[PDB]
Motif scaffolding. Structure first.
Motif, PDB file in Angstrom:
ATOM      1  N   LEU A  55       0.818  -1.207   0.000  1.00  0.00           N
ATOM      2  CA  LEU A  55       0.000   0.000   0.000  1.00  0.00           C
ATOM      3  C   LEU A  55       0.853   1.257   0.000  1.00  0.00           C
ATOM      4  N   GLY A  86       0.862   3.907  -3.041  1.00  0.00           N
ATOM      5  CA  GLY A  86       0.660   5.329  -2.841  1.00  0.00           C
ATOM      6  C   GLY A  86       1.849   6.179  -3.223  1.00  0.00           C
ATOM      7  N   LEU A 139       3.122   9.862  -6.998  1.00  0.00           N
ATOM      8  CA  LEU A 139       4.051  10.965  -6.779  1.00  0.00           C
ATOM      9  C   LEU A 139       5.267  10.844  -7.694  1.00  0.00           C
ATOM     10  N   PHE A 170      -5.679   1.564  -6.505  1.00  0.00           N
ATOM     11  CA  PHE A 170      -6.235   1.771  -5.175  1.00  0.00           C
ATOM     12  C   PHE A 170      -7.584   1.091  -4.966  1.00  0.00           C
ATOM     13  N   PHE A 198      -7.807  -2.928  -2.698  1.00  0.00           N
ATOM     14  CA  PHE A 198      -7.817  -2.877  -1.240  1.00  0.00           C
ATOM     15  C   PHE A 198      -9.152  -2.372  -0.710  1.00  0.00           C
ATOM     16  N   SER A 199      -9.848  -1.548  -1.490  1.00  0.00           N
ATOM     17  CA  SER A 199     -11.210  -1.173  -1.138  1.00  0.00           C
ATOM     18  C   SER A 199     -12.160  -2.350  -1.311  1.00  0.00           C
ATOM     19  N   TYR A 239       2.497   1.208   5.913  1.00  0.00           N
ATOM     20  CA  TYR A 239       2.252   2.251   4.927  1.00  0.00           C
ATOM     21  C   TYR A 239       3.236   3.394   5.097  1.00  0.00           C
ATOM     22  N   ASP A 253      -8.614  15.604  -2.739  1.00  0.00           N
ATOM     23  CA  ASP A 253      -7.835  14.548  -2.100  1.00  0.00           C
ATOM     24  C   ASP A 253      -7.088  13.667  -3.101  1.00  0.00           C
ATOM     25  N   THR A 306      -4.673  17.065  -5.691  1.00  0.00           N
ATOM     26  CA  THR A 306      -3.854  18.107  -5.078  1.00  0.00           C
ATOM     27  C   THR A 306      -2.432  17.628  -4.806  1.00  0.00           C
ATOM     28  N   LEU A 333       0.620  19.713  -6.629  1.00  0.00           N
ATOM     29  CA  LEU A 333       1.734  20.276  -5.880  1.00  0.00           C
ATOM     30  C   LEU A 333       3.080  19.812  -6.431  1.00  0.00           C
ATOM     31  N   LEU A 347       5.812  15.067   4.853  1.00  0.00           N
ATOM     32  CA  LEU A 347       4.773  15.877   5.461  1.00  0.00           C
ATOM     33  C   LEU A 347       3.762  15.058   6.261  1.00  0.00           C
ATOM     34  N   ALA A 348       3.758  13.729   6.129  1.00  0.00           N
ATOM     35  CA  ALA A 348       2.799  12.898   6.846  1.00  0.00           C
ATOM     36  C   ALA A 348       3.326  12.376   8.178  1.00  0.00           C
ATOM     37  N   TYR A 383      -7.133  23.815  -0.285  1.00  0.00           N
ATOM     38  CA  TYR A 383      -6.171  23.124  -1.143  1.00  0.00           C
ATOM     39  C   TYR A 383      -6.056  23.781  -2.509  1.00  0.00           C
ATOM     40  N   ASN A 413     -15.350   2.709   0.972  1.00  0.00           N
ATOM     41  CA  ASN A 413     -14.059   2.897   0.330  1.00  0.00           C
ATOM     42  C   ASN A 413     -14.171   2.891  -1.194  1.00  0.00           C
ATOM     43  N   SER A 444     -11.938   9.595  -7.159  1.00  0.00           N
ATOM     44  CA  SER A 444     -10.513   9.812  -7.394  1.00  0.00           C
ATOM     45  C   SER A 444     -10.148   9.554  -8.851  1.00  0.00           C
TER      46      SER A 444
HETATM   47  C1  LIG Z   1      -5.841   2.366  -0.872  1.00  0.00           C
HETATM   48  C2  LIG Z   1      -5.865   2.644   0.631  1.00  0.00           C
HETATM   49  O1  LIG Z   1      -4.844   2.779   1.236  1.00  0.00           O
HETATM   50  S1  LIG Z   1      -7.466   2.775   1.487  1.00  0.00           S
HETATM   51  C3  LIG Z   1      -8.574   3.776   0.435  1.00  0.00           C
HETATM   52  C4  LIG Z   1      -9.988   3.871   1.068  1.00  0.00           C
HETATM   53  N1  LIG Z   1      -9.961   4.703   2.287  1.00  0.00           N
HETATM   54  C5  LIG Z   1     -10.323   6.131   2.226  1.00  0.00           C
HETATM   55  O2  LIG Z   1     -10.299   6.784   3.207  1.00  0.00           O
HETATM   56  C6  LIG Z   1     -10.729   6.781   0.871  1.00  0.00           C
HETATM   57  C7  LIG Z   1      -9.584   7.707   0.387  1.00  0.00           C
HETATM   58  N2  LIG Z   1      -9.318   7.466  -1.053  1.00  0.00           N
HETATM   59  C8  LIG Z   1      -8.033   7.887  -1.654  1.00  0.00           C
HETATM   60  O3  LIG Z   1      -7.841   7.696  -2.819  1.00  0.00           O
HETATM   61  C9  LIG Z   1      -6.959   8.609  -0.765  1.00  0.00           C
HETATM   62  O4  LIG Z   1      -6.577   9.798  -1.394  1.00  0.00           O
HETATM   63  C10 LIG Z   1      -5.725   7.776  -0.464  1.00  0.00           C
HETATM   64  C11 LIG Z   1      -5.274   8.109   0.970  1.00  0.00           C
HETATM   65  C12 LIG Z   1      -5.997   6.258  -0.530  1.00  0.00           C
HETATM   66  C13 LIG Z   1      -4.565   8.126  -1.440  1.00  0.00           C
HETATM   67  O5  LIG Z   1      -4.929   7.787  -2.799  1.00  0.00           O
HETATM   68  P1  LIG Z   1      -4.731   8.967  -3.988  1.00  0.00           P
HETATM   69  O6  LIG Z   1      -6.067   9.349  -4.555  1.00  0.00           O
HETATM   70  O7  LIG Z   1      -3.854   8.445  -5.097  1.00  0.00           O
HETATM   71  O8  LIG Z   1      -4.018  10.292  -3.311  1.00  0.00           O
HETATM   72  P2  LIG Z   1      -2.359  10.521  -3.283  1.00  0.00           P
HETATM   73  O9  LIG Z   1      -1.682   9.272  -2.732  1.00  0.00           O
HETATM   74  O10 LIG Z   1      -1.865  10.781  -4.677  1.00  0.00           O
HETATM   75  O11 LIG Z   1      -1.989  11.833  -2.311  1.00  0.00           O
HETATM   76  C14 LIG Z   1      -0.683  12.405  -2.439  1.00  0.00           C
HETATM   77  C15 LIG Z   1       0.138  12.214  -1.149  1.00  0.00           C
HETATM   78  O12 LIG Z   1       0.654  13.378  -0.791  1.00  0.00           O
HETATM   79  C16 LIG Z   1       0.092  13.871   0.395  1.00  0.00           C
HETATM   80  N3  LIG Z   1      -0.838  14.920   0.147  1.00  0.00           N
HETATM   81  C17 LIG Z   1      -2.089  14.872  -0.337  1.00  0.00           C
HETATM   82  N4  LIG Z   1      -2.571  16.124  -0.383  1.00  0.00           N
HETATM   83  C18 LIG Z   1      -1.616  16.943   0.078  1.00  0.00           C
HETATM   84  C19 LIG Z   1      -1.567  18.308   0.250  1.00  0.00           C
HETATM   85  N5  LIG Z   1      -2.662  19.246  -0.073  1.00  0.00           N
HETATM   86  N6  LIG Z   1      -0.492  18.885   0.732  1.00  0.00           N
HETATM   87  C20 LIG Z   1       0.586  18.138   1.062  1.00  0.00           C
HETATM   88  N7  LIG Z   1       0.550  16.795   0.896  1.00  0.00           N
HETATM   89  C21 LIG Z   1      -0.553  16.206   0.404  1.00  0.00           C
HETATM   90  C22 LIG Z   1      -0.577  12.717   1.133  1.00  0.00           C
HETATM   91  O13 LIG Z   1       0.316  12.187   2.165  1.00  0.00           O
HETATM   92  C23 LIG Z   1      -0.768  11.664   0.031  1.00  0.00           C
HETATM   93  O14 LIG Z   1      -0.356  10.467   0.465  1.00  0.00           O
HETATM   94  P3  LIG Z   1      -1.450   9.510   1.260  1.00  0.00           P
HETATM   95  O15 LIG Z   1      -1.721   8.273   0.433  1.00  0.00           O
HETATM   96  O16 LIG Z   1      -0.884   9.116   2.611  1.00  0.00           O
HETATM   97  O17 LIG Z   1      -2.746  10.253   1.469  1.00  0.00           O
END
Ligand SMILES: CC(=O)SCCNC(=O)CCNC(=O)[C@H](O)C(C)(C)COP(=O)(O)OP(=O)(O)OC[C@H]1O[C@@H](n2cnc3c(N)ncnc32)[C@H](O)[C@@H]1OP(=O)(O)O
Length: 424
Positions: A19, A23, A27, A46, A49-50, A155, A243, A246, A250, A263-264, A305, A372, A379
């Protein structure tokens, strides 16, 4: 029973490694300047896993004789996933395109990380069934919080540690004396090392039906949970654009993916603290109250955002990148993940409120699966609608964020009282 719960923690860290890598790949691909139709075609990774419940009875119904019922799909899934990581570490030198500036063949990378995620999700099912029988009944909640901390830590080792150890820029600013290029670990070395870890922990842990689908069809035929299904599919459209897009906009407009991953690391202590705060709204008789009161704050942080991506080109990138930008984006991501985690614990509290103890162990994760799915399909629709909305004179992300915020407040003002009355 510490000798088993540490093994279960290690198996959930190895759950979180695919995972974290899945993710990390968006990037990296946005750092390689790929278009967003290719990104939306990648964003199917993604979904398994959902949607792991759609093959969870297929993997919990069959097992081998004179062996563990859930170990029969733990160790072959672990061996196939580790050998697939060895092959992916061999082939990822040409899948990403680190040789002679070739284009990222994202379709092969999509099917690789899609089957890779798929194996990760069915291994999660194998451990979540294996947790109920390996340890005692007295420690059954310790298995759930161990799932939580192991998933989040694995993760962390795949999304944040890999990106923090992937580039030359962060690994020559920090973590190294006498700086040298190409970073600590590439994706080939990281995949090969965790594949070797998969093979050795698999060898050590090995040497030391249609009635359920008919039940799920009857449940999704039932009217109130069908209404919740349609509501949670059309709910998360309002902020899934922010979500999902963004974190890549960036990367395009300038802040590096390594800093966006690091940043996490201030959020995982707050990820510990926040369910201990919203436990009152969890245990309360109206668990969707904090859902409905965190919906407009999450949409306003979606506009924040959009304002932050608009503010990113107006700050200087050359030389030392400024720390006030990082404290602004860290407070922004902190408040946004506060409302994400409150919304998520509201959905989990609603599922614990509604799921009857008869078929609760299936109905709980069915509502988790459909929430999920409703989080991960807009997305993909968002990343697919990035490119037709780019008029780069007028960028597509801002008009997409405005249109999706209008969709989210339309959902709010039109389906608020219905989604609030579904909990009664
Ligand atoms: C697949 C799984 O792990 S469980 C999914 C089901 N659960 C949920 O809550 C639904 C959320 N659905 C999503 O798609 C969520 O965005 C995630 C967390 C699964 C990530 O999937 P993506 O759509 O590809 O988002 P993405 O990974 O490109 O986000 C960019 C990264 O930069 C960071 N980021 C996102 N936005 C910002 C921002 N505005 N500023 C700085 N950093 C940011 C985050 O850490 C993110 O990593 P993350 O996966 O820990 O969230």
């Amino acid at each position: 029973e510490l000798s088993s719960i540490l093994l279960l923690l290690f198996l959930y860290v190895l759950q979180g490694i695919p995972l974290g890598l899945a993710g990390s790949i968006p990037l990296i691909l946005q750092s390689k300047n790929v278009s967003y139709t290719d990104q939306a075609f990648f964003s199917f990774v993604f979904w398994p896993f959902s949607l792991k419940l759609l093959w969870a009875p297929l993997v919990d119904a069959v097992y081998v004789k004179n062996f563990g019922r859930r170990k029969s799909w733990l160790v072959p899934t672990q061996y196939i996933l580790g050998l697939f990581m060895i092959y992916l570490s061999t082939q990822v030198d040409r899948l990403l395109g680190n040789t002679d500036d070739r284009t990222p063949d994202v379709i092969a990378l999509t099917v690789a990380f899609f089957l890779f995620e798929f194996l990760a999700a069915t291994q999660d099912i194998a451990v979540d069934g294996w947790a109920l029988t390996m340890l005692s009944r007295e420690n059954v909640g310790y298995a759930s919080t161990c799932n939580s901390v192991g998933q989040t830590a694995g993760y962390f080792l795949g999304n944040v540690l890999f990106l923090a150890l992937e580039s030359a820029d962060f690994c020559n600013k920090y973590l190294r004396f006498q700086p040298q290029p190409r970073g600590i670990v590439t994706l080939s070395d990281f995949l090969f090392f965790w594949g070797t870890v998969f093979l050795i922990t698999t060898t050590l842990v090995a040497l030391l039906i249609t009635d359920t689908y008919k039940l799920l069809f009857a449940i999704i035929k039932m009217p109130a949970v069908l209404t919740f299904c349609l509501l949670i599919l059309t709910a998360k459209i309002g902020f899934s654009a922010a979500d999902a897009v963004t974190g890549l906009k960036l990367v395009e407009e300038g802040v590096p993916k390594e800093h966006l991953a690091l940043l996490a690391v201030p959020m995982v202590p707050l990820q510990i603290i926040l369910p201990l705060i919203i436990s009152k709204y969890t245990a309360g008789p109206q668990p969707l109250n904090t859902f409905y009161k965190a919906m407009p704050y999450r949409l306003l942080l979606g506009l924040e955002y959009a304002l932050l991506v608009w503010w990113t080109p107006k700050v200087e990138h050359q030389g030392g990148f400024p720390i006030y930008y990082y404290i602004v984006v860290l407070l922004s991501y902190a408040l946004h993940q506060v409302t994400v985690y409150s919304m998520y614990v509201s959905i989990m509290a609603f599922n614990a409120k509604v799921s009857d103890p008869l078929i609760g162990g299936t109905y709980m994760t069915l509502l988790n699966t459909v929430s999920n799915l409703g989080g991960n399909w807009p997305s993909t629709v968002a990343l697919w609608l990035v490119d037709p909305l780019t008029v780069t004179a007028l960028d597509g992300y801002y008009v997409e964020s405005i249109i999706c915020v209008f969709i989210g407040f339309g959902w709010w003002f039109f389906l608020g009282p219905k989604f609030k009355k579904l909990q009664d």
